[PDB]
Design a protein around this motif. Structure first.
Motif, PDB file in Angstrom:
ATOM      1  N   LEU A  76       0.831  -1.203   0.000  1.00 46.24           N
ATOM      2  CA  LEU A  76       0.000   0.000   0.000  1.00 46.24           C
ATOM      3  C   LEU A  76       0.865   1.253   0.000  1.00 46.24           C
ATOM      4  N   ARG A  92       2.688   1.906  -3.194  1.00 50.98           N
ATOM      5  CA  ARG A  92       1.877   2.528  -4.247  1.00 50.98           C
ATOM      6  C   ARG A  92       1.675   4.022  -4.002  1.00 50.98           C
ATOM      7  N   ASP A  93       1.546   4.437  -2.738  1.00 53.66           N
ATOM      8  CA  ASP A  93       1.509   5.870  -2.408  1.00 53.66           C
ATOM      9  C   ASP A  93       2.793   6.556  -2.841  1.00 53.66           C
ATOM     10  N   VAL A 138       4.845   5.659  -5.206  1.00 51.96           N
ATOM     11  CA  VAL A 138       4.888   5.783  -6.660  1.00 51.96           C
ATOM     12  C   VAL A 138       3.997   6.936  -7.118  1.00 51.96           C
ATOM     13  N   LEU A 139       2.812   7.075  -6.515  1.00 41.09           N
ATOM     14  CA  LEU A 139       1.933   8.192  -6.876  1.00 41.09           C
ATOM     15  C   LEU A 139       2.590   9.538  -6.579  1.00 41.09           C
ATOM     16  N   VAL A 156       5.188  10.301  -9.149  1.00 39.88           N
ATOM     17  CA  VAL A 156       4.469  10.751 -10.348  1.00 39.88           C
ATOM     18  C   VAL A 156       3.933  12.168 -10.159  1.00 39.88           C
ATOM     19  N   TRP A 203      11.669   1.775  -3.549  1.00 37.47           N
ATOM     20  CA  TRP A 203      10.242   2.062  -3.360  1.00 37.47           C
ATOM     21  C   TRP A 203       9.650   1.254  -2.221  1.00 37.47           C
TER      22      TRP A 203
END
Lengths: 219, 219
Positions: A14, A17-18, A20-21, A24, A182
């Motif tokens: 979880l 993924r935060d 990576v966001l 981005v 990451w």
């Protein structure tokens, strides 16, 4: 696989993924302008910002006093059963902490310490010792995992694993300046949410690698 | 909060972050070109694609036969203890399934059914009945949750909750055409990974709402 291991794995993924966001949310700024320097609706940007900002607000809401030493012992026990024993890795805990307490988010700190140790285990060869050092100094909790790294173990398909395959692969990649693998995002997020800091050292040849976690005691 | 509830919550949030990344991976295509139609390095796009493609490959790797009816009963039991009982929601299971088996990813299907029911519970007022209907037909497992919705309950701070606050808020937002509430991403991903489909109906006034899940039996 215990429920606890699966829960920690999902938390880790979880937060990755935060991370990576957020990368981005940051990195598209510059190549966009180079196109526009020849002479991306912000609303799309803001709805990712709202996600990360929500997680940020979640990580500040639960502080309560708890005993530090049982948290350390639980960490060692969970990683031993989840991965270290089946990888032949010896875990060692070095701490003078006995009765000390911390006003913190115990569950998030527990996830952070679990990942701090599990990452080192994933990056260890059979027979390696992974050491968790932990102490307090004035207003700060300091937890350091140190070990002789075998980063090829992260992606070895003959070895048991707990962390996600693509996360383990990404962790062997050369790191941009100042950036973590990451998969360690949970450690960094939880440290910074406790007014602290997280440092991922390099994979050192002939020398121990370290992960360094700090969190403020009374935030 | 049981370990199982926390694990399911983290899985739900994980897949919701994947969903947001995939939307971002898609939606920036058009406003970019409008700027460039006046007369974003793809490498940034591809490293989000690699994340989602990795999850895609994870969801295809574990298929094994299991009994469908104990999975349904476990779902009801887990949501009852996690949220329905403390929200005053009655759960009902309607199924003729007794001994039927499915060659599937039991843990991912379990997470999907948990979320299918938990979402309806989060969107229910005290005293509402949430019904899980489930059956097989030829090559397909069909699971439908139907209930009289009170979507304001999703964001009511006086009610207990399991799903993330921002996810619950986002779920009350008007849906773009063909798109789900982000928090249901796990249901959609797991359904499509089993060569199936997921449909989120609208919040219907004076009529039941439905969530419809389908998965291929022998994939």
């Amino acid at each position: 696989v215990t429920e606890r291991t699966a829960r920690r794995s999902a938390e880790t993924a979880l937060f990755m993924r935060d991370h990576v966001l957020s990368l981005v949310s940051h990195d598209l700024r510059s190549p966009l302008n180079a196109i526009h320097s020849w002479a991306q609706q912000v609303k799309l940007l803001e709805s990712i910002v709202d996600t990360t900002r929500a997680e940020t607000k979640a990580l500040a809401l639960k502080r309560a006093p708890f005993a530090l030493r049982p948290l350390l012992d639980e960490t060692i026990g969970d990683v031993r059963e989840g991965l270290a024993a089946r990888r032949g890795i010896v875990l060692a805990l070095n701490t003078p902490l006995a009765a000390q307490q911390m006003d913190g988010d115990r569950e998030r700190l527990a996830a952070a310490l679990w990942l701090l140790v599990t990452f080192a285990v994933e990056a260890s060869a059979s027979g390696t010792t992974v050491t968790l050092d932990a102490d307090v100094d004035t207003a700060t909790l300091r937890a350091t995992v140190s070990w002789q790294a075998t980063p090829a173990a992260l992606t070895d398909p003959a070895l048991p694993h707990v962390l996600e395959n693509f996360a383990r692969a990404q962790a062997t990649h050369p790191r941009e300046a100042g950036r973590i693998s990451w998969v360690l995002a949970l450690c960094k997020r939880v440290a910074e949410a406790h007014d602290g800091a997280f440092e991922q050292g390099e994979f050192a040849d002939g020398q121990s690698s370290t992960l360094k976690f700090r969190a403020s005691l009374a935030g």
